[PDB]
Amino acid sequence: PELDELWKRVKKLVTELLEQAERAGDPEEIFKLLEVAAALVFLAEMFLRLAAIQEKATDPEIQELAERVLRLIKRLLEEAERAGDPRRIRELVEVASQLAFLLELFYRLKEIQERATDPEIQELAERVLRLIKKLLKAAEEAGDPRKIHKLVFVAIVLLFLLQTFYRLKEIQEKATDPEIQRKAQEVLEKIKRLLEAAERAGDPAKILLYVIRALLLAMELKFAYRKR
Amino acid sequence: PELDELWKRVKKLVTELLEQAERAGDPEEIFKLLEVAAALVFLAEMFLRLAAIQEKATDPEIQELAERVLRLIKRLLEEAERAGDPRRIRELVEVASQLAFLLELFYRLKEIQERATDPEIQELAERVLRLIKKLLKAAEEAGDPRKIHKLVFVAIVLLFLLQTFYRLKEIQEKATDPEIQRKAQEVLEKIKRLLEAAERAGDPAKILLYVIRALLLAMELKFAY
State the distance between the two ends of chain A, measured CA to CA, in whole angstroms: 47
* Residue from B212, B220, B221 whose CB has the most chain A CBs within 10 Å, to mutate: B212
CB atoms within 10 A of CB B8: 12
d(CA A166, CA A184): 12
Annotated resolution, angstroms: 2.0
- Say if the Cβ atoms of B38 and A215 lie within 8 Å: yes
Give which of B146, B166, B162 is closest to B194, Cα–Cα: B162
d(CA B222, CA B179): 15
Amino acid letter for position A35: E
- Say if the Cβ atoms of A31 and B157 lie within 8 Å: no
Q: For residue A80, what are the CA distances in angstroms to A77, A137, A138?
A: 5, 21, 20
Measure in Å the smallest separation between the Cα of A122 and chain B Cα atoms.
22
Q: In sequence order, what are the residues at sequence separation of 6 or more whose Cβ sits closer than 8 angstroms to the Cβ of residue B170?
A: none
Secondary structure (3-state) at B75? helix
CA dihedral B31, B36, B40, B45 (to 10 degrees): 60
Q: In sequence order, what are the residues at sequence separation of 6 or more whose Cβ sits closer than 8 angstroms to the Cβ of residue A189?
A: none
Chain B hits for A219, Cβ within 8 Å: 7, 41, 44-45
Find the chain B residues whose C-beta atoms sit closer than 8 A to any C-beta of A.
Answer: 1, 3-4, 7, 11, 14, 18, 21, 27, 30-31, 34-35, 37-38, 41-42, 44-45, 47-48, 51-52, 55, 146, 150, 153, 157, 160, 164, 203-205, 208-209, 211-213, 215-216, 219-220, 222-223
Q: How was this structure determined?
A: X-ray
- Say if the Cβ atoms of A212 and B34 lie within 8 Å: yes
- Say if the Cβ atoms of B223 and A7 lie within 8 Å: yes
- The minimal CB distance from A18 to the residues B21, B44, B212 is found for B212
The DSSP 8-state label assigned to residue A203 in this structure reads: -
- The minimal CB distance from B51 to the residues A157, A204, A226 is found for A226
Give which of B51, B48, B50, B43 is closest to B14, Cα–Cα: B43
